[PDB]
Design a protein around this nucleic acid. Structure first.
Lengths: 124, 48, 224
RNA sequence: AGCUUUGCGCAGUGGCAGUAUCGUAGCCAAUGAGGUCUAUCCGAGGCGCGAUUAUUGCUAAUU
RNA sequence: ACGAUACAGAGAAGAUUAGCAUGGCCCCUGCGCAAGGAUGACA
RNA sequence: AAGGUAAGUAU
RNA sequence: AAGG
C-alpha cells in the first residue's frame, strides 16, 4: 500500500477534486511545481495549500513540507500518485510536490477555500 | 456622354466640376468591379 | 481517475489529427473520389485570381466571388447551428448540473435571522432554495427565524453566500453540517407566533434540535 | 433566467513574419531544464540527430 | 595515316513562372465540451 | 619551343 | 569517301 508516514492521505474523490483544482490553478498561473518551489512559497507565505505525492522514494525528501506547513499555518495533503500529480500540474515528468499560490481576485478562491476546509478536516 | 458634352459646350468660363462615375454602384459591388464595368462602358462608347 | 494532458501533448494531438485529415483529403482528391479544391477568392483577391475573367465580365465575376464567400459563410453557420444546444436541452444540462447526488449524504445549514418581515426577502429565499433544490423550512417568530436548508454542498455554499453578502437585525449561521437523509420538503415559510407549536412542527420532521439551538442562541444574544 | 472567467475542440474573418517550422522506440529534466542582470534569488524544457524551396501540398503555364 | 569535304555550330549559365491552400504567430467572432465566478427578481 | 586543339555526326 |  502507501507509506504510513503520509498520514493525511486523500481518498479517491478528494484526489480527483485536488487534481482538478491543481490543473485549474496551472491554467490560471497560480501553481508552483516541485518541492523546492513549494518550500520557497511556504517561506514567503504565498501558498494556499501544498499537495505532495505518497510515492516519492524516499518519502523523507518531502516530509519537511508538513513541518513548514505547520509552521506557516498552511494546509497540506498527500496524493497516492506522483505521476497523476505531475500530469495535473501540466508536466509529463512526475511531480512529488506542488504549491497553489495566493492571487487576489482569482476566480479559484472559493474552490481553494473549499479544498482547504476539506483537507484540514481529513488529517485525523 | 451627353451629360458631359453639353455641360462643357454650354460652359462660358473655366470651372472645376466634380462628378461620380460610380453613381449607384458601390452600394452593391466593390470598387474593383465598378472600375472594370466603367472601363468596359467607356471602351464600348469609344469604339461605337 | 482521469489523466490530464500537457500543452505540448495537446499540440501534438491537434497537429497529428489535422495532418491525418489533410492527408485523407489529399488522398481522396488524388484518387478521384473528391474534386480538387478551387482557389479561395475574396474581394481583395478577386483580381489576383481572375483578372482575365474580371475584365470581360466584371459583374459576373463579382457575383461568382460573392457566391463563393456566401457559401463559405453559410457552411460555417450551418456547422455552428447544427451543433447547437436545443433550448430545452440547455435547461436539461443546467437542470442536471445543479442536482447534486444526495444519495451519499445531505448537507444541512441552520440560520437565525432577527427580522424576516420583508416579502421580497421571503421570495428571494424561497426562489433561491427552490432553484438550488434546497429543501427546508422557514419558521417565523418575533426574534427567532430558523432557516433550515438541506441539499448539496455547492447549493449550500451558494445559499450561505446569498444571505451572507447578497441579502442583508442580522443574519447568523447557527449550524452547518450533514445528515444521513433529508427531513424537510420545499420552502413553506411557516408562521409560528409561539415557541411551543414551532418546536412541535420541528419535531414533526424530527429536527427539533435546530429550533432548540436557535432559541438558546437567541436567548444568549438577548442576555448579552 | 441572463451574464461572465478558464481550458479544450471546431470553424469564420483579419493581421503579421518565412534565418524557420517540424520529427525524437535519442538522451536529460520540477527527485530541477536553464541561469549575462535581481543569486539564501529566478523555474521549463534543454541537448544530440534528422527533414526542408528555413513547413508541406495541389493548380496553372512553358515542356 | 592526318587532312580535305558535306552538315550542324550558342564552342561556358536547372536564368523558369504565377495562383491558392496549408504551416507558424497574434487577435476577433460563432458553436460545441468540461468546469466554474458575480449579480438581479412581489403573494 | 610552348602557355593559340572547339566537341562532333556523316562521306 | 582518299591517303602510309
Amino acid at each position: 500500500d502507501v507509506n504510513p508516514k503520509a498520514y493525511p492521505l486523500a481518498d479517491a474523490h478528494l484526489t480527483k477534486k485536488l487534481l482538478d483544482l491543481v490543473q485549474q490553478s496551472c491554467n490560471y498561473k497560480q501553481l508552483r511545481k516541485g518541492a523546492n518551489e513549494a518550500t520557497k512559497t511556504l517561506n514567503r507565505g504565498i501558498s494556499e495549500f501544498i499537495v505532495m505525492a505518497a510515492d516519492a522514494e524516499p518519502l523523507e525528501i518531502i516530509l519537511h513540507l508538513p513541518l513548514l506547513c505547520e509552521d506557516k499555518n498552511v494546509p497540506y495533503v498527500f496524493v497516492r500518485s506522483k505521476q497523476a500529480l505531475g500530469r495535473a500540474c501540466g508536466v509529463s515528468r512526475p511531480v512529488i510536490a506542488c504549491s497553489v499560490t495566493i492571487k487576489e481576485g482569482s476566480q479559484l478562491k472559493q474552490q481553494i477555500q473549499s479544498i482547504q476546509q476539506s483537507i484540514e478536516r481529513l488529517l485525523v | 456622354v451627353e451629360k458631359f458634352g453639353d455641360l462643357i459646350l454650354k460652359a462660358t468660363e473655366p470651372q472645376m466640376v466634380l462628378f461620380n462615375l460610380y453613381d449607384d454602384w458601390l452600394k452593391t459591388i466593390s470598387s474593383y468591379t465598378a472600375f472594370s464595368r466603367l472601363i468596359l462602358i467607356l471602351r464600348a462608347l469609344h469604339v461605337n | 481517475l482521469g489523466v490530464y494532458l500537457t500543452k505540448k501533448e495537446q499540440k501534438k494531438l491537434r497537429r497529428q489529427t489535422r495532418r491525418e485529415a489533410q492527408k485523407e483529403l489529399q488522398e481522396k482528391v488524388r484518387l478521384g473520389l473528391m474534386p480538387p479544391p478551387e482557389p479561395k477568392v475574396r474581394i481583395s483577391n478577386l483580381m489576383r485570381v481572375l483578372g482575365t475573367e474580371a475584365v470581360q465580365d466584371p459583374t459576373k465575376v463579382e457575383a461568382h466571388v460573392r457566391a463563393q464567400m456566401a457559401k463559405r459563410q453559410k457552411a460555417h453557420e450551418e456547422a455552428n447551428a447544427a451543433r447547437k444546444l436545443t433550448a430545452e436541452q440547455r435547461k436539461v444540462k443546467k437542470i442536471k448540473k445543479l442536482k447534486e447526488d444526495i444519495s451519499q449524504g445531505v448537507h444541512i445549514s441552520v440560520y437565525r435571522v432577527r427580522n424576516l418581515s420583508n416579502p421580497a426577502k421571503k421570495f428571494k429565499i424561497e426562489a433561491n432554495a427552490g432553484q438550488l433544490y434546497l429543501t427546508g423550512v422557514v419558521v417565523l417568530h418575533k426574534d427567532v427565524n430558523v432557516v433550515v436548508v438541506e441539499g448539496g454542498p455547492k447549493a449550500q455554499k451558494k445559499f450561505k453566500r446569498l444571505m451572507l453578502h447578497r441579502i442583508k437585525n442580522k443574519c447568523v449561521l447557527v449550524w452547518e453540517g450533514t445528515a444521513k437523509d433529508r427531513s424537510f420538503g420545499e420552502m413553506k415559510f411557516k408562521q409560528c407566533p409561539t415557541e411551543n407549536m414551532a418546536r412541535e412542527h420541528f419535531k414533526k420532521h424530527g429536527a427539533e434540535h435546530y429550533w432548540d439551538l436557535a432559541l438558546s442562541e437567541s436567548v444568549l444574544e438577548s442576555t448579552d
